[PDB]
Structure 1
Amino acid sequence: GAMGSMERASLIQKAKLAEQAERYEDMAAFMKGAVEKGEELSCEERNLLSVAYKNVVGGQRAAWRVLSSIEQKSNESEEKGPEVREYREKVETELQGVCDTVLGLLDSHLIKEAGDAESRVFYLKMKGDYYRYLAEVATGDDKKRIIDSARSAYQEAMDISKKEMPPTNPIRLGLALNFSVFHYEIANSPEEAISLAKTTFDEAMADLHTLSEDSYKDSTLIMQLLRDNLTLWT
Structure 2
Amino acid sequence: GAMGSMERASLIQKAKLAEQAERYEDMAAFMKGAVEKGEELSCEERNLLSVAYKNVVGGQRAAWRVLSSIEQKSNESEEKGPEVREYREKVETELQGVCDTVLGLLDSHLIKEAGDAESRVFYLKMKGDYYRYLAEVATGDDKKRIIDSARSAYQEAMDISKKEMPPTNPIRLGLALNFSVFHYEIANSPEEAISLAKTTFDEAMADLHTLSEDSYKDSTLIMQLLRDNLTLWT
Instruction: Output the CA distance in 2 between the equivalents of 1:107 and 1:79.
Output: 43
Instruction: Output the CA distance in 2 between the equivalents of 1:42 and 1:55.
Output: 20
Residue 5 of structure 1 deviates from its aligned partner by 0.2
Residue 37 of structure 1 deviates from its aligned partner by 0.1
Instruction: Output the CA distance in 1 between the equivalents of 2:91 and 2:168.
Output: 37
Name the residue aligned to 2:229: 229
> C-alpha deviations, 1:35-61, integer Å up to 9, x for none?
000000000000000000000000000
2:39 aligned counterpart, secondary structure:
coil
1:39 aligned counterpart, secondary structure:
coil
Name the residue aligned to 1:150: 150
Name the residue aligned to 2:63: 63
Instruction: Output the CA distance in 1 between the equivalents of 2:79 and 2:20.
Output: 44
Q: Is 1:36 the equivalent of 2:36?
A: yes
Instruction: Output the CA distance in 2 between the equivalents of 1:8 and 1:22.
Output: 21
Q: Is 1:26 the equivalent of 2:50?
A: no
> C-alpha deviations, 1:197-219, integer Å up to 9, x for none?
00000000000000000000000
Instruction: Output the CA distance in 1 between the equivalents of 2:130 and 2:79.
Output: 34
> C-alpha deviations, 1:54-86, integer Å up to 9, x for none?
000000000000000000000120110000000
Compute the TM-score of the two structures, normalised by the length of structure 2.
1.00
Instruction: Output the CA distance in 1 between the equivalents of 2:121 and 2:86.
Output: 38
Name the residue aligned to 2:192: 192
2:50 aligned counterpart, secondary structure:
helix
Instruction: Output the CA distance in 2 between the equivalents of 1:18 and 1:226.
Output: 30
2:2 aligned counterpart, secondary structure:
coil
Residue 172 of structure 1 deviates from its aligned partner by 0.1
1:141 aligned counterpart, secondary structure:
coil
Instruction: Output the CA distance in 2 between the equivalents of 1:74 and 1:190.
Output: 29
Residue 143 of structure 1 deviates from its aligned partner by 0.5
> C-alpha deviations, 1:172-231, integer Å up to 9, x for none?
000000000000000000000000000000000000000000000000000000000000
List aligned pairs for 1:96-111, cutoff 5 A.
96-111=96-111
List aligned pairs for 1:125-164, cutoff 5 A.
125-164=125-164
| Identity level (%) | 100
Instruction: Output the CA distance in 1 between the equivalents of 2:160 and 2:58.
Output: 27
Q: List gaps (5 residues or longer) in structure 2.
A: none
> C-alpha deviations, 1:21-44, integer Å up to 9, x for none?
000000000000000000000000
Instruction: Output the CA distance in 2 between the equivalents of 1:182 and 1:47.
Output: 21
Instruction: Output the CA distance in 1 between the equivalents of 2:180 and 2:133.
Output: 14
1:46 aligned counterpart, secondary structure:
helix
Instruction: Output the CA distance in 1 between the equivalents of 2:62 and 2:51.
Output: 16
Residue 136 of structure 1 deviates from its aligned partner by 0.1
Cα RMSD (Å) of the superposition? Answer: 0.2
Compute the TM-score of the two structures, normalised by the length of structure 1.
1.00
